[model samples]
Target: YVENLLTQLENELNEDNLPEDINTLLRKCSLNLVTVDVKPLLATIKRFLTSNVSYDSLNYDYLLDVVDKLVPMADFDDVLEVYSAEDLVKALRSEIDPLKVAACRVIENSQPKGLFATSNIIDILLDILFDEKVENDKLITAIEKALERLSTDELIRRRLFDNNLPYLVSVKGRMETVSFVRLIDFLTIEFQFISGPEFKDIIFCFTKEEILKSVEDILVFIELVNYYTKFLLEIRNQDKYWALRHVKKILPVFAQLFEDTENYPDVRAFSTNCLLQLFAEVSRIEEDEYSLFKTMDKDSLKIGSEAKLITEWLELINPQYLVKYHKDVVENYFHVSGYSIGMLRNLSADEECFNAIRNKFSAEIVLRLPYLEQMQVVETLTRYEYTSKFLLNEMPKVMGSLIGDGSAGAIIDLETVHYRNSALRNLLDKGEEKLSVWYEPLLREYSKAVNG
Candidate 1:
């Protein structure tokens, strides 16, 4: 019976190696047996593996097939121990990638279903990931799957976090999935579970890559942030401890993004827009940080220098944007007058800023203002009057260029701007004096259009 076959198998284990004919037959025969006394069969197989230890894909495959079946059955760890899972773990160094992958898989599965063996499994996988010697996609992939499987243990997850290893893993570029979208979604979920120093490390990843790896990578990074925005906000809401920490990290980074002149505009704007979302919700919380409180007290939603960075879009891309990687640059920055007017002072050094703002009124908003940006021009002029004297003095010329030019897009827009900004025209009356005349005719035309 099978008992005699196993006895012969064990006797054979006394030899220098498991015979290839026997190893393949054992795997095939074991799988078809509806019942194999697992313990003796396990002991026999361990001897077979140890006897057969020279590295080759065939033995590795033979080992893999046998273990895969045994893994989900009872006492899988005992069986694996009999086979010296330690030896299989080291097979990762066998200088053979495909076999190393199989060995990595075998070790990962052989680890206990419980926490006791988690580190052992993680160590084996990290070896493969870190191995400068292993370069094949198959091995990298198996190692990734192995790490992911080992990490699924809740205890293992905590260990990964406690050690701050996931952040570095995410940073290390092991995320080279064929579809980057898949890669992004992955890092997003992985990091969602941990939050402190990881934030600093991750922020560096977003800004540090000068050209960024790919449009695909930037999209993935963006999507990762977008999906977890609420997740981050939840942590941020826990206290000013988080709010201040986050704003402190993001504010200057966001500023350097635009302030530095050589950064990509898209990413700078993209980060600027997303980074402050946490702080914007601060006042609603029970406690707030001082610098942040002062920010709210002054500009509230905008942290210090946010106004300056955003007001001048031209500066950031000299600001190529990861943000611009997708949306229209003008639309992205000037989509709304979200911040306070008191902060718009950084206008054109050509002046610093987004095109959306440029021609809405004059050369400042758009160096080339199409008649389309009229209401926007009015919006800025209305919301922020004393914010900049330069824009104020430039208003009359902007009016000449757009208003009396007689394009319906121009006159019609200023008229509407006049109404929305009725207070603004009066503000202009006092500030720019005769600059007020440029606004009046447009004002009457707007009133006439609306009333008629």
Candidate 2:
């Protein structure tokens, strides 16, 4: 029944003067199973679209309608091969969404054939990608996949940077949030095309001038911090040397942004997040051939140097400043406070950073923080213990202070009555034996009394 109905529709489509709502019939028919070929039909539609720059024709919708159905069929490549890169670019730029969406699918499927690397097509794709109003998730995702696939070509990757970097620099803060985010994300992939030193050179793109000028606009600072944070995060898991060589150059910028109380709280929070990534140990362990060279040799030296750099980097960030920043920003932007504590957590993995944090992060401050941040305070202590034996003696005393000061009691009461699956309770339950000693009894007493 379905085949005959589609056959009937295809036969009807072969005749002229179909109604404007022909898509209603097109939707019900499977174009692939019909005996009639669709290549000429698609070509005719494309010719109409190409000849007229304005896409107000009924053929535009008809083309999208036919391709939308035909793409799922095996003969889709025949349709894909028929359109030039220019034709696809023009279709992708349509004001009508289905045309753009159909073009996205065709472009993604045809990427293996090198359709995307065509210079004009890349520019068109970038324009579509960076358009803030182009909010369709599928289209954006397909474009990213197509771009990433083509980016393996060094020339294409270089073209990506050359074409967009100046545009980004000139438009810096004036871009909308979505465009800036998509651009930064695409730039992260583009940055992979360079070596460690090239990455260092590119770091100057966010120069001290840009950093200082951004202070006048909150959006500018947010954009700058977001860009900085994204790039740092991308390099974090790559070559260890990439992060080690570049961190000091970027640190001064983040340090200034983080330390300035005049900046927006969310901006400071974002900068704090960037600092956290900078201090982490690189996770990629496979050694490239360069470890054999005279300038840098041996896995142990790599490991030792990385450890040393982390210790030195933590000191430069200054545990005291972070503690003070937390206190200053906790009320306005709690995210800053959380990330500040997270940075301290990462820092506590080093003995020098641990000592500085232990001196400044007293139980009084911990108790005053909201419950979730209090969990991080415990996490910082636990990380300190992981790196140093001295934290063993200190951990119990910190938990002891909280237990004595009604902090533990208040958290327990709230958990028993309102939040049985409380985060702080679970954290304490999994703490060191000495620390657990303080909370376990309190928790046991609460559960027994509350239930019975």
Candidate 3:
């Protein structure tokens, strides 16, 4: 019955010329079949939907008449369910453009179920990820959206995590066009959701063998190490300061990547700064626990290895080359100033250089009062309880004249610079909006000094 009606409708609709009344009557007859099985009607509509002929080549009014009649007769939910992953695979395998579009839309809108869960969808997605032919933005967005959806399921999340980690690590040297920023963002998000030790285990799963093998090419090796450093830094389990402490401990491994390059100043500079920052943090921690420094495990030993490498490289290049690189080395050292000072205080072979640094600190307070005020404020806040009370109490006195200088900004500029330099900006900005734990004490001290 439906076939006969479809045949009659097609005959009327396919005409080169037909009366307006005749076309209207044909459309009315097609829409009048409320009792016919929709399956046959839908099949007929699908054939027209899949047609490649431009609408301009066809009888436009007749095509609209047929579409208007058939659309109301189809069930959207049933259509979506019928075109599941199995059907999608079949359509994808075919050469028909319309079938491919339909399949893509169906798979996109439909959720995977049962056997579809075990299907090759992830493999296909990974192919898209690594496919150089794909546009970077489009490929990245699609992969991110798909991963976001897949992550909603706990089982799927774990499976993808387990499967993708090694693959991602293996592609370290192979990713020619991948953006490091996007890759790091994705990995950082994943790291936050997973357990830290488990995440570390996954990252180091292949040990040093796979890393050395994948990084045979220097550029790729540098890129991998850079991303690795970024990832290790992003796993913030505690406060930003505490996370920084842990991350500083882990950065020495990356320094080793640049250890052998005597001619590569850029690489050496970066590695030197990395080790400097790590060692500086270690020194700060040790200084804060002055009496317990001996009992504490030597966390900075790895950083010392990097330092020794830099020293060896300097010796190899030119015996006096460190003189030229002294500024960069000193800048890194000064970031953790206390540690740098302690190192000089303990191990300086040249008494002149050591005395120069110490004397500079003293002279700055004695003569550079403006600079002294800023430094004292930072030192007081950061090392307050960590250092001796006598040292902390003397900060304001050391900067006495500068604090009285009307031109000296309210709340030393050092505080502003500190917040700007560190990740503490977010916290400090929010704290400024309300009140900060540090604010009251600082203000009280300022008031007491002004009145006194």
Candidate 4:
């Protein structure tokens, strides 16, 4: 009947001077199918969808006429009697974005159940999403969703976690981190589901006698600590076993990391950024939701023997204290690396004591550099509106602070102040008309602070 309807419709489409409302024209022709009350042939539906972007032509309503009608009947399950599973997978090869989504879902739904039966089809979709890397991000994200739905089939979830997960992580640790973040977020749902209480599975979980363990890469460890902190915090109001978390077991890892933070101070900054994510400062998604692909933080569920035992101790003694103490460590450590100088610049213009942060930043890093570095800093200062003001606010104070005291010696003793002044003069002159605007205020401030 649908074939007959399509056959009759093709006759009207043959006319010249078709109506401007293609949908109206399509409806005029759709009556043939309505008379028979036939579901459109899938091939006819495919051809109609393909026709939309095939060339210059008014497209039929894909939502009302195509997807609403055809998606229901797309039984790719071997289509045992007709279009086979092989046919559906092949259909996805070059379809437009929406059709690709439709095709992959049909393929996932139609496949013979179980991991082995569907693995090959799933692999091809993976190729398009990750390997081809040609699809736009929207399409790629859909492909990920399709895989999630695919895993819900009976026993497939176990095989996915058992076999495919390790391979994905191995590949993840080596890929450009941006892409890895995407994949990790895709898996965060399952990882959180299975992350357990192996903080110490046995009686000797902590033993009390063995307090700490040596970990080689503290930054990576700290990054995991932060990632799990998000994981733990997110699960609280939901997952019942949320109580089974290893935070106590985990906090000791941080205790040890804190003990070692002095060595990795600047390097540890990135990981601390991960912990900061708990407050949503570094993430894109809601706080209680599963992790999403943001740069840098890579989380996992693997708790090793050392993590099991040490976190047990951190838990036993006091886990929250460890969290606070570690927080303080990273906060204090930044002062050593001078990254605090870089961090302050990202704050709002309304940040409290804005002038002092800029002033202290000059003392901390900018004024502490040599001529080439100072010139680069000066150019950056002059190039932006706020930093330009930052220069005016900060540069004058550089000289005063080096010798400021009740009875300080001649400024000549602090030779670097002379060098810093020379750099500031060069910036002011080279900046000429561009920098002349700030000269008045800075001169007034400098004289008041120095001579007074």
Whole-model lDDT values for every prediction? 0.45, 0.51, 0.42, 0.42
Best by lDDT: 2
- Per-model TM-score on C-alpha atoms: 0.38, 0.50, 0.45, 0.41
Model 1 stretches with alpha carbons more than 4 Å out? 1-36, 39-63, 83-89, 96-103, 110-121, 164-189, 192-452
Checking candidate 2 for backbone clashes, the offending pairs are: none
Q: Write the per-residue lDDT of candidate 4 for residues 1-452, one digit (tens) a residue.
A: 56644445444344453335545545544454445422234444455444544424545343224333343344543233233456546656755765565555455444444633454556556557555355466567656666665565645554554445555544444433445445445545444434343212221122222222212444334434444555555555445343333333433344333334576464345454443333232222232232222112223211122332233222121212222223332222222123232333222122232332343354556556553344434443443455555565556553333223423223344544443344345445545455565555445434543565
RMSD of each: 16.8, 11.1, 14.1, 17.3
Q: Tell me the tens digit of each residue's lDDT in model 3 across 156-199.
A: 54555565657666554344545333444456555545544344
Residue 132 of model 2 has an lDDT of 85
Give me the runs in candidate 4 sitting further than 4 Å from their true place.
1-20, 23-41, 48-53, 58-83, 95-98, 107-119, 162-166, 192-227, 234-274, 277-452
List, residue by residue over 239-327, the lDDT tens digit for candidate 1.
32443343343333332333333445565545545534433333223343344334433432332235454543322221212122312
Cα error, residue 296 of model 1, in Å, equals: 20
Evaluate residue 148 in candidate 1 and report its C-alpha lDDT on the 0 to 100 scale: 62
> On a 0 to 100 scale, what is the lDDT of residue 368 in model 3?
42
Model 3 CA deviation exceeding 4 Å by range: 1-119, 148-153, 161-188, 196-206, 213-216, 234-256, 262-383, 387-392, 398-452
Q: Which residue runs of candidate 2 sit more than 4 Å off their true CA positions?
A: 1-80, 89-101, 111-118, 127-145, 162-182, 192-204, 243-247, 262-452
Evaluate residue 108 in candidate 2 and report its C-alpha lDDT on the 0 to 100 scale: 55
Give the range where candidate 1 is weakest over 10 consecutive residues by summed lDDT: 317-326
lDDT of 2 by residue, 92-209 (tens): 7666555566666566555354545645677777878887877788678778876776676655655556666565554445445577667667766666666643343442255576
